[PDB]
Assembly symmetry: C5
Homo-oligomer: 394 residues x 5
């Protein structure tokens, strides 16, 4: 009886085109805020943040006011899209093909004209995603909101603190906070300035998944590449082991190339770590080739340079703690035995060259172990957020 009469009196002469203020010269105050429910996806390749957000706009409408004594029990009214004036607040850095992803809902309005409008939405926004320190990265994704066509002389956009009380954690991102800032900017379109309200979502990557799928797999494969330095040369499988580990390393390099944006603003930390690992395994194949040359050295070839027999077989070999008819028979058997003696001297030279290969294996075992550890530790702990990651996520 009363709800029917109010809806009829409130729409008399109403115009959703008119900005709802008593004095046309003043700007209309609009308080903007939002509630962050869920971070659905951070698309590092497309540089897009997907979020589930309820936006919160509130203002006063001069013409949507009634006396609750004259409409008993009628304290709030509701209006759908197009039936009352709303602020046309849009996400400026939308990455949605439709641009505006807001699902339109009612505007709630109480008897003093106070209007509340909380349209839900799944929003996609453009966010520079800084992959310099990935997977130990912190991202600061901006969500810029402002009236599209109402400047500051017409619409006084004000900011209120973001709501995270109903926020649902994500398993890949720890929300650090959603600080906001109201700015007043000029655009070359217009002489009037246009206020906006930007919310910056500070979200920290959780690193357990990436530790177990990217960082830890790489360390063990790096350790496998050092088993080439422990394989005997006579096994015949050093290059197979080494080059196969190297082919195992490209699957990870393509996994990173597939998830990282194709940008030149910097080189990700993961890229520097995988590139260094692949250069340490790629250099262990180069060293393996040199080792095999020493092991398979032709004894009747060039003698061992004196610099080599001291640098390897003395210094490094100490540091590593390795260490008438009867005369014709005589002539003929002497040839057989002398042939054996020549084979022993050639064999001794071969064993001497083989021992050099063993020393080079041990040296480059130690050398590549130090390179792996320092590069692994140095690259990973160069990230500002590495210590925080191992404390919280491990």
């Amino acid at each position: 009886e009363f709800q029917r009469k109010l809806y009829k009196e409130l729409v008399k002469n109403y115009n959703p085109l008119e900005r709802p203020v008593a004095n046309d010269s003043q700007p209309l105050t609009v308080y903007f805020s939002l509630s962050l429910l869920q971070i659905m996806d951070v698309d590092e390749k497309n540089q897009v943040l997907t979020t589930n957000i309820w936006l919160q706009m509130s203002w006063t409408d001069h013409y949507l006011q009634w006396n609750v004594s004259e409409y008993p029990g009628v304290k709030t009214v509701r209006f759908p899209d197009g039936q009352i004036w709303k602020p046309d607040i849009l996400l400026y850095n939308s990455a949605d093909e439709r641009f505006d992803a807001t699902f339109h809902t009612n505007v709630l309005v109480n008897s003093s004209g106070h209007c509340q409008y909380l349209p839900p939405g799944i929003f996609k926004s453009s966010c520079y995603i800084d992959v310099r320190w990935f997977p130990f990265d912190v991202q600061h994704c901006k969500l810029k909101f402002g009236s599209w066509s109402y400047g500051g002389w017409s619409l006084d956009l004000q900011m209120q603190e973001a709501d995270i009380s109903g926020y649902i954690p994500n398993g890949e991102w720890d929300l650090v906070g959603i600080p906001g800032k109201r700015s007043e900017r000029f655009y070359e379109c217009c002489k009037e300035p246009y206020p906006d309200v930007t919310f910056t979502v500070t979200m920290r990557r959780r690193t357990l998944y990436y530790g177990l799928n990217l960082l830890i797999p790489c360390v063990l494969i790096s350790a496998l590449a050092l088993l080439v330095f422990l394989l005997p040369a006579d096994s015949g499988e050093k290059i197979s082991l080494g080059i196969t580990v190297l082919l195992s390393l490209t699957v990870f390099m393509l996994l990173v190339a597939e998830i990282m944006p194709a940008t030149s603003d910097s080189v990700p930390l993961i890229a520097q770590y995988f590139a260094s690992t692949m250069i340490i395994v790629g250099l262990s194949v180069v060293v393996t080739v040199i080792v095999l040359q020493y092991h398979h050295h032709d004894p009747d070839g060039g003698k061992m340079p004196k610099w080599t027999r001291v640098i390897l077989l003395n210094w490094c070999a100490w540091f590593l703690r390795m260490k008438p008819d009867l005369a014709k028979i005589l002539e003929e058997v002497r040839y057989i035995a002398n042939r054996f003696r020549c084979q022993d001297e050639s064999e001794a030279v071969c064993s001497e060259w083989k021992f050099a290969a063993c020393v080079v294996d041990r040296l480059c075992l130690m050398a590549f172990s130090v390179f792996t550890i320092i590069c692994t530790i140095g690259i990973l702990m160069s990230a500002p957020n590495f210590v925080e990651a191992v404390s919280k996520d491990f």
Copy 2:
């Protein structure tokens, strides 16, 4: 004649904005429920549940009432979207870019004003998908529904049991049940509380497909890694077999990484099982390198430590039940034979070192077999739902 007259009388002065109650101060009771027809997809990567649902809302409309004696044969009427008041019940945790995925249909209304509204829909909802016990997991996906803009003082949302009579089974998920609960919650938006009705779909993963594509393939590949301990060392193919099985293991690790969400709330069971398997095969490559060092040991190198000739060649080798001119000719032939004797002693030392490699193969064959069985059995039967899975799905 009568259907035409009723549709004309029923819309006189009607307003789809007005909540349809006789006394404005009372809230309107709305019974919400749903019918689960089909679970279309559980997206574990995007944390999204897709379902085919008919929602069921029912209420009374004070103004949609007629006397069937005055409209003979006219017992029900129908109204499309926007022509009569409806409750704006929305899925709160929608994951649809449009947010609201409901296909709007008629509202059926009989002569006493009882309104029935059953819009079908394909819904996408946000569901925390707990992959801790995957593939023997049970999921509890919530579907939260409530009026967006009508609080409890206006809309008394009530719950009714979910319908599963027309439910069509899925081959990957056994519906355990769809219990629902009506809750009354406060939000920082509003001083009035807002009732909602949540339905939790309890669905058990069926594990035959994952047994045959993830778990069983892994067991056999684990068994293949133990064939390296049975390959003779002289074959020249131990590292090839071992490292190739290890490269066969990464295809599965990338298959899991591709279907699992990138989260740090826990490590899936499948991840722990594949990671342990890859550490058992990766450790069989380390042990294989040690075996080859023993087999290819230089006889003129360091002698065998006394601890090694007892631990392996006595204890473990028993447990495993393995086990003037004529003088110049004399001098020259004595060298040939003594050279042969030195070769036999060197060969005996080599065979002794080769026998150690064989014992180490058998020990690590048994040791890695126990590790594989205990890790396989221990990790799999640590799942609460493993026994149920093998009973129902196998």
Copy 3:
């Protein structure tokens, strides 16, 4: 002059809400049918059938009637969506995010009120896709259609034979037929029953593509695995060949896992055939390891069990049709020759062990050939539709 006057008289007092019958108590008869133009896609992973369909609804409208003598040349009229009453027939098992995929078009209406409505559409429907016999499978995909909100007391849905005259064949599916059936069902929503009309599309998979991409590639790779039994052991490439063929077999297992739905209602025929093939190649690697143990057997190790020298070197080797100073010189040369004699006896034992490996190769060549043929033939001809496939598609 007359078309303008008819469109004006026909809309006087018309209501698209009113069901178009003269007697409100009777149900309106609606004949439903469809024309199948093209099967666009059978999505076995998502269990979705895509089809290009024109639906065919026809009924009578009491108020859309004129005398063609009074409107010369005006024999048919046309009305767009929302301007005249239509039946709200929907696909019940729609898999489209919008649910209703029908493109709305005109309703044609002649002078006696007969209405024809043929909206085209690309439809996606939920279809249980039975992959038990894939790729020799026949599918029976249902398309359930009925009025959403009009029960049987209001809408007498009747069925007419499906049109396939304009059907365009697909290269993967031979349409067997589109039988339909009208059913009358009750739902827990409603006390009134709701008729529906279901069309079952019986479509046979054409198997040439899958013969050439799945079945034939697998047979040849199975034959390659038997070449390991023909490779000499001294080549050093048996495990490389065997395990490489095994790695070639996983690419196919992942191709099947990617196109098959992740369901536990059964194991596909292709899964049983590839799993058996991979178990025959995986068992040829196990047997290869045993062969290499025989070939590389240490002659100074355990002697050959008497059961082995009869089972292999007699039975199977027949079946397969294989088959003062002068005394010091004397002492020293006798050692050299006796050392040679011991080497010959050790070599004879080695050749004896090598011959056992050759016999085992031939036995397991024959044994695995029979297993491959019987498993290949047995699994493939266990399909009811295998004989039909080779007759029609090959």
Copy 4:
């Protein structure tokens, strides 16, 4: 002043439902055509042609006529969708989920009532894509257009030549032409026939990309498979080379399987060429196994059949142009030398068997070279359009 007055007079009593003809009994002539701007994509897997098209419809409207002397400067008027009658011409073989992909724009109308309507659009259409001769294929994709609900007694659809003046070439398809044909067909829906206008886009695949990504890579890999016949047997890498080239061949077979539709209307040319190449490399692995059996033949085994020592070591080896105490010492040394002599005869037999392997390598080098060339040339030049391709694209 005049544009305002014309828009007001022209809509008086106008009805967009009425077909715009003076005599209702006559059909309305509509000239249909189109402008082909760009071929966006030919989807061979989904059998869908995407094109950027402007459609061109023109007709006369009896009621949209004015005297330009009475509306000075007003020579054309414009009307948006729904405000004037339009022909409901649709693409019949649309593959778009919405079915109708036309972007609606104004209808231009001059003073004699002539209406021009050029809606742009991105269209997806169903096109049988004949992959028999891929990548040297020519496709004839039909675009069928006709009024959905207006038959020939109401709408006289006429055809005009297609415009390609603003056509923008594509790098994969050379437009050969867009011939059109107007047809008059009957459908089982209706007793009246329905004219349509079909345009067939004849487009020739440009083959440079596919020459460099499919055909040329395959030829070189085929040539690599012949290097197995040049590898010495003592290298120990024949199977590794051969089987690795075979694994290199499957990456291409899966690339083709991924881009080709899963159809059984024929076997593509590329499929026959890759299948023959893989059977020539797969047969070079079989022959390699036979070669290794000859090379590793046990000298104490079965003698060489006389047919083998003539067919290979005579004929083919000519064609290929290959080619008291002193008596105890005597007894003992005679054994040593006779043992050497037996080793030489066994070695001579081994070298004889090794020479057979070399001849078989050279024969099968020549034989597989001829097979590769004839199969490569024969399969490729069996395409009708191969000569055109190498002339235009190379």
Copy 5:
């Protein structure tokens, strides 16, 4: 009070169909421009440029004028889509399924009738993407804009400089500039010409990511292929190394084939560089086979041609700076020693053939190093933009 009165007076008799000019014979001037905010994506495979753009249209409306003295404080008004006349400016080369991707917003209008309309949008446009010089390419993507249905006699489209003040850099593309040009063209549709305004976005690819993911990985793999020329032949791993590096090269060839459009307008620079690298590694496998033939040459086979013993073992070997009863015993031992002597001469011939293989390794090491460097440098520095790339991006 005044905003309400202006919105009411301004819509009296207004028609959004009427072009807003005082004199109908004159064309309406419209200034078109745009603001480039962000380049979202350059799709080289689909030939589509995605951009975030605000379009800027401005014109005068004769009927939207008021005296601000009569409406105090009312200086601007706003109108939504369909309520006032707008120019129907469309992107001509749109690649969006909807064609028009513009998000409609208000038109701002001040008291002298000046209208400003800045609809945002995410636009997809067809752009010929010239991949000839990829990854050192510069692209010139056109965005053609014009009124769809208003020709030059009605709509005088004028151009204004593009705004890039709010442009946000992209990590893959450096915006070089957005020059625009206004053109007046004729179309076969129409006798009247139709102005358009085209903006060409000149964007330079940033090459760090592609240097590290495509170019640098390829160089090192090319260097690895040269390690085959340093591996000793006795290692038994030359083909394994060589062919494995060749299989490592196909992963890159498929990565390029996946991101490049399938076009025959040219061969990309990356394609020529990878194809040359794969032909240098593929030719190092051919040369490796020849080397192994020399190393494994049968000493009892054909002698070394005199041309070979000079070209390799003299010239190239200097350039490279490589370098009664007692008579029976006598007869028997003479055989043993003469057998040894024959083995030494055969061994000397073998070592001579082995030395040739070593020289060929060193020659082809140097030769392939020069080929790699010249092909690497020559192909890369043939790009006009290579020097700019290394200066700016490295």
